[PDB]
Scaffold this motif. Structure first.
Motif, mmCIF file in Angstrom:
data_model
loop_
_atom_site.group_PDB
_atom_site.id
_atom_site.type_symbol
_atom_site.label_atom_id
_atom_site.label_comp_id
_atom_site.label_asym_id
_atom_site.label_seq_id
_atom_site.Cartn_x
_atom_site.Cartn_y
_atom_site.Cartn_z
ATOM 1 N N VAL A 41 -5.479 -6.820 2.172
ATOM 2 C CA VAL A 41 -5.257 -5.503 1.583
ATOM 3 C C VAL A 41 -6.474 -4.607 1.816
ATOM 4 O O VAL A 41 -6.323 -3.476 2.292
ATOM 5 C CB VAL A 41 -4.864 -5.579 0.085
ATOM 6 C CG1 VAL A 41 -4.656 -4.196 -0.488
ATOM 7 C CG2 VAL A 41 -3.595 -6.392 -0.109
ATOM 8 N N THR A 42 -7.674 -5.123 1.488
ATOM 9 C CA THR A 42 -8.937 -4.399 1.663
ATOM 10 C C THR A 42 -9.112 -3.934 3.108
ATOM 11 O O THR A 42 -9.392 -2.758 3.336
ATOM 12 C CB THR A 42 -10.118 -5.239 1.174
ATOM 13 O OG1 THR A 42 -9.956 -5.505 -0.214
ATOM 14 C CG2 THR A 42 -11.450 -4.543 1.391
ATOM 15 N N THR B 225 -0.397 -3.332 -4.878
ATOM 16 C CA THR B 225 -0.404 -4.674 -5.426
ATOM 17 C C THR B 225 -1.627 -4.845 -6.314
ATOM 18 O O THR B 225 -2.648 -4.170 -6.120
ATOM 19 C CB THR B 225 -0.309 -5.757 -4.332
ATOM 20 O OG1 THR B 225 -0.506 -7.040 -4.964
ATOM 21 C CG2 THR B 225 -1.315 -5.550 -3.189
ATOM 22 N N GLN B 226 -1.522 -5.756 -7.284
ATOM 23 C CA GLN B 226 -2.627 -6.077 -8.188
ATOM 24 C C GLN B 226 -3.360 -7.324 -7.690
ATOM 25 O O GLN B 226 -4.460 -7.634 -8.162
ATOM 26 C CB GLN B 226 -2.132 -6.234 -9.639
ATOM 27 C CG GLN B 226 -1.060 -7.332 -9.824
ATOM 28 C CD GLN B 226 -1.370 -8.315 -10.953
ATOM 29 O OE1 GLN B 226 -0.462 -8.909 -11.544
ATOM 30 N NE2 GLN B 226 -2.651 -8.536 -11.278
ATOM 31 N N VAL B 227 -2.778 -7.980 -6.673
ATOM 32 C CA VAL B 227 -3.374 -9.159 -6.048
ATOM 33 C C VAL B 227 -4.384 -8.634 -5.041
ATOM 34 O O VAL B 227 -4.001 -7.994 -4.065
ATOM 35 C CB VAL B 227 -2.337 -10.075 -5.339
ATOM 36 C CG1 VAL B 227 -3.009 -11.334 -4.797
ATOM 37 C CG2 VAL B 227 -1.175 -10.429 -6.270
ATOM 38 N N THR B 228 -5.666 -8.827 -5.297
ATOM 39 C CA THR B 228 -6.653 -8.376 -4.325
ATOM 40 C C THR B 228 -6.792 -9.470 -3.273
ATOM 41 O O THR B 228 -6.660 -10.665 -3.589
ATOM 42 C CB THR B 228 -7.937 -7.773 -4.955
ATOM 43 O OG1 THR B 228 -9.040 -7.887 -4.059
ATOM 44 C CG2 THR B 228 -8.278 -8.361 -6.327
ATOM 45 N N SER B 229 -6.994 -9.055 -2.032
ATOM 46 C CA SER B 229 -7.081 -9.927 -0.863
ATOM 47 C C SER B 229 -7.848 -9.239 0.219
ATOM 48 O O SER B 229 -7.934 -8.004 0.235
ATOM 49 C CB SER B 229 -5.680 -10.272 -0.348
ATOM 50 O OG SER B 229 -4.947 -9.136 0.088
ATOM 51 N N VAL C 76 0.849 -1.198 0.000
ATOM 52 C CA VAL C 76 0.000 0.000 0.000
ATOM 53 C C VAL C 76 0.882 1.244 0.000
ATOM 54 O O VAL C 76 2.050 1.174 0.396
ATOM 55 C CB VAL C 76 -1.002 0.044 1.195
ATOM 56 C CG1 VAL C 76 -1.921 -1.177 1.213
ATOM 57 C CG2 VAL C 76 -0.262 0.199 2.536
ATOM 58 N N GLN D 110 -3.868 3.726 -0.939
ATOM 59 C CA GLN D 110 -4.258 2.868 -2.058
ATOM 60 C C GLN D 110 -3.421 1.613 -2.082
ATOM 61 O O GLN D 110 -2.315 1.622 -1.562
ATOM 62 C CB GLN D 110 -4.082 3.609 -3.408
ATOM 63 C CG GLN D 110 -2.603 3.905 -3.730
ATOM 64 C CD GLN D 110 -2.308 4.248 -5.162
ATOM 65 O OE1 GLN D 110 -2.969 5.076 -5.789
ATOM 66 N NE2 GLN D 110 -1.201 3.693 -5.650
ATOM 67 N N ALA D 111 -3.901 0.568 -2.753
ATOM 68 C CA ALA D 111 -3.150 -0.665 -2.920
ATOM 69 C C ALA D 111 -2.132 -0.470 -4.029
ATOM 70 O O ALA D 111 -2.424 0.185 -5.028
ATOM 71 C CB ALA D 111 -4.088 -1.798 -3.293
ATOM 72 N N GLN E 211 -9.065 -0.140 4.664
ATOM 73 C CA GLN E 211 -10.278 0.304 5.362
ATOM 74 C C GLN E 211 -9.830 1.013 6.640
ATOM 75 O O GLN E 211 -10.262 2.128 6.908
ATOM 76 C CB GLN E 211 -11.099 -0.934 5.725
ATOM 77 C CG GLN E 211 -12.591 -0.957 5.555
ATOM 78 C CD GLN E 211 -12.999 -2.339 6.035
ATOM 79 O OE1 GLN E 211 -13.007 -2.620 7.255
ATOM 80 N NE2 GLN E 211 -13.132 -3.279 5.096
#
Ligand code: PTY
Ligand SMILES: *[C@@H]1O[C@H](CO)[C@@H](O[C@@H]2O[C@H](CO)[C@@H](O[C@H]3O[C@H](CO)[C@@H](O)[C@H](O)[C@@H]3O)[C@H](O)[C@H]2NC(C)=O)[C@H](O)[C@H]1NC(C)=O
Ligand SMILES: *[C@@H]1O[C@H](CO)[C@@H](O[C@@H]2O[C@H](CO)[C@@H](O)[C@H](O)[C@H]2NC(C)=O)[C@H](O)[C@H]1NC(C)=O
Ligand SMILES: *[C@@H]1O[C@H](CO)[C@@H](O[C@@H]2O[C@H](CO)[C@@H](O)[C@H](O)[C@H]2NC(C)=O)[C@H](O)[C@H]1NC(C)=O
Ligand code: NAG
Lengths: 186, 168
Positions: B136-137, B129-133, B116, B126-127, B141
């Motif tokens: 990360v979310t 990484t392109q790997v959503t998880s 991030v 913001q993230a 938050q």
């Protein structure tokens, strides 16, 4: 070693009285902790799906939940400072006494004043920094309730006489129950 | 010119961390940070700040470390992190020669991979990484939920950091 009978409220939404209903009218967790100075293998055991955690995991959970419940109880008791309001008052006083017993049982693992690690005996500033994210997460307007708690502990230490945040917190909660009990007369 | 700050945090488990960091003004090394979570030594290699002012800076950095550790503990408790784990925070302020607004940054990497980063314009994370998880979310938050991690952080970079560069 020691045995700590923990009264653990939920991790879900509801009134604190309702969450602790069976405790107010009387089924929570029996722990067994082991501690040594140079040994890093310091573990806690949960009896009765029974678990084994590290001392640090148990202690973090205990402090984090003590802080979350204090805020939850205080917001419920500020709302009425009514019949359940007097019942809420009696359960809170019972709960403060239960938490004081839990704390003294945990303290039996130490039996030394200078030799109680800084890690488990933080001051107001450190405690409020360390548990900012963990406690704040639970609450709507969590940032403000946390600042209100810190200022109220700072007022407690000023009125009494650097020293452990948990002892200042016990003084704050014992005072809430005193104000609470005195008000239930009228 | 610039003030860069680097913090490496080695987590053996959620409850124990070894910090190793440093800061540089322009080309050279001005500060060093090292130690376990409970006893982290923070030093200014040169007397840039007078005793009282340095004590205030140390206090702010120590509070930051406790809060940082607290966030890692929270992410683990809520979403589960795989330990051992290393976190790298690279941050700073750079004052353009032309005279335009200072460029500021705060980039976080986990186990050597981009995670991030802070965007100062709207004070949001913001993230990278392109790997959503879920991890990360959840972390985003939390970072985007509080004045502390948004506005106070932007003020540290745009105001505190910039003024420090202008002074030394
Ligand atoms: C005039 C003197 C100033 C210059 C100082 C120079 C000294 C350099 C020291 C050498 C060592 C360098 C390494 C340390 C860098 C630390 C940066 C400090 C940041 C800081 O204090 O920010 C405060 C907010 O804290 C926060 O924002 C805490 C929240 C934590 C966010 C963590 C970031 C993301 C991590 C994500 C991990 C998640 C894990 C998931 C895998 C700002 O406040 P303030 O200092 O302005 O005071 C406001 C009073 N109220
Ligand atoms: C960040 O990097 C760490 C190492 O660089 C990594 O830790 C490694 O994690 C694996 C898997 O958890 C451990 O392997 C053990 O566990 C598996 C479980 O299925 C067993 O099958 C293996 O035989 C083994 O016992 C490694 O031991 C561990 N590395 C070290 C040196 O302790 C973290 O998981 C990484 N964290 C993130 C967030 O990416
Ligand atoms: C803080 O940490 C280390 C201290 O040596 C520095 O990292 C090295 O940076 C140089 C380039 O400037 C690289 O050649 C090395 O490989 C880096 N080390 C590692 C382990 O990767 C860093 O420069 C120091 N200072 C700052 C401001 O970050
Ligand atoms: C607490 O304070 C410092 C660390 O903040 C400790 O001293 C360190 O000792 C190790 C090993 O000799 C060094 O790597 C550190 O850099 C030293 N720091 C300083 C400031 O000199 C000290 O021993 C710690 N004491 C306790 C009881 O935890
Ligand atoms: C956050 O900062 C803004 C100012 O930018 C302010 O309006 C707000 O009241 C602050 N406090 C909290 C706890 O949100």
């Amino acid at each position: 070693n020691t045995e700590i009978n923990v009264i653990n409220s939920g991790d879900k939404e509801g009134y604190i009285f309702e969450k602790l209903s069976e405790f107010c009218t009387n089924n929570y967790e029996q722990w067994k902790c082991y501690y040594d100075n140079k040994k890093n293998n310091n573990k806690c055991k949960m009896e009765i799906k029974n678990k084994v955690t590290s001392f640090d995991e148990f202690f973090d959970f205990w402090v984090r939940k003590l802080l979350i419940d204090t805020i939850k109880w205080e917001t419920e008791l500020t709302y009425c400072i009514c019949n359940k309001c007097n019942k809420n008052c009696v359960c809170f006083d019972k709960w403060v006494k239960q938490k004081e017993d839990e704390w003294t049982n945990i303290m039996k693992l130490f039996t030394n004043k200078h030799d109680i690690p800084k890690k488990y005996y933080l001051n107001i500033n450190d405690l409020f920094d360390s548990f900012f994210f963990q406690v704040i997460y639970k609450f709507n307007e969590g940032e403000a309730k946390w600042n209100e708690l810190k200022e109220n502990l700072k007022k407690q230490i000023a009125s009494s006489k650097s020293e452990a945040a948990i002892k200042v917190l016990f003084n704050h909660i014992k005072e809430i129950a005193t104000i609470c009990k005195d008000n239930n007369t009228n | 010119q610039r003030l860069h700050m680097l913090q490496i945090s080695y987590f053996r488990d959620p409850y124990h961390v070894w910090y190793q960091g440093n800061a540089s003004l322009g080309g050279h090394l001005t500060h060093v940070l090292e130690g376990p979570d409970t006893n982290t030594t923070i030093i200014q290699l040169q007397p840039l700040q007078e005793p009282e002012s340095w004590a205030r800076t140390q206090s702010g950095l120590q509070s930051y470390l406790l809060q940082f550790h607290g966030l890692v503990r929270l992410v683990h408790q809520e979403r589960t992190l795989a330990f051992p784990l290393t976190i790298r925070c690279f941050l700073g302020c750079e004052l353009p020669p032309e005279g335009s607004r200072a460029h500021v940054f705060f980039e976080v990497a986990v186990n050597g991979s981009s995670f991030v980063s802070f965007r100062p314009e709207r004070a949001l994370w913001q993230a990278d990484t392109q790997v959503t998880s879920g991890v990360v979310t959840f972390t985003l938050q939390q970072l985007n939920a509080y004045n502390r991690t948004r506005y106070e952080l932007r003020e540290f970079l745009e105001d505190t950091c910039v003024q420090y560069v202008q002074k030394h």
